[PDB]
Amino acid sequence: AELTPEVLTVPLNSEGKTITLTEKQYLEGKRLFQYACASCHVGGITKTNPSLDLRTETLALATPPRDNIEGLVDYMKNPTTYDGEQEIAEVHPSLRSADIFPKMRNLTEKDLVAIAGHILVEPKILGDKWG
């Protein structure tokens, strides 16, 4: 609904720690996600591979868990297959493949956190519309 505490608060790691994103992080997240991710994940979907969307439940069942800030930031640095067995930076934009995916060259740690925050917050605002 509105940017209330539960909407802005998401898991920071898989151990249970949480983080309450700021309104500024919320706005930065929308800007950055549109810039570097929307081309393939607009609205939470995943073009070319619909089943591996950005819905929170889908991320929670990924390996390692991607339903928390650290897990998503880690994915943006070193993306892996859903079972976490193989790294896929050559196909998936990441800091490790920033040479062939230029838009990733300009992302700071703070930017990565904001983008991760966007992914975890949106479904709480859009419900099923996300994904």
Residues that bind ligand HEC (CB under 6 A): 36-37, 39-41, 46, 48-49, 52-54, 58-59, 62, 66, 72, 75-76, 81-82, 92-93, 115
| Cα gap 73→65, rounded to integer Å | 12
Cα–Cα distance, 60 to 67 (Å, whole number): 5
Report the nearest approach of ligand HEC to the CB of residue 15 (Å).
Answer: 19
Amino acid at site 67: D
Helices (H), 3-96: 5-8, 23-36, 38-41, 56-60, 69-77
Tokens 């040479």 correspond to 99
Is there a binding annotation on residue 118? Answer: no
Task: Please say which residue, 2 or 81, places its beta carbon nearer to ligand HEC.
Answer: 81
Q: How far is the CB of 55 from ligand HEC (least distance, A)?
A: 7
Q: How far is the CB of 7 from ligand HEC (least distance, A)?
A: 19
Nearer to ligand HEC, 1 or 53 (CB): 53
Smallest gap from Cβ 122 to ligand HEC, in A, equals: 12
Known binding residue 41? Answer is yes
Q: Which residues contact 78 (CB under 8 A, 6 or more apart)?
A: 87, 89, 94, 95, 96
Instruction: Output the known binding site.
Output: 41, 92
**Binding site per annotation, positions for heme c:** 41, 92
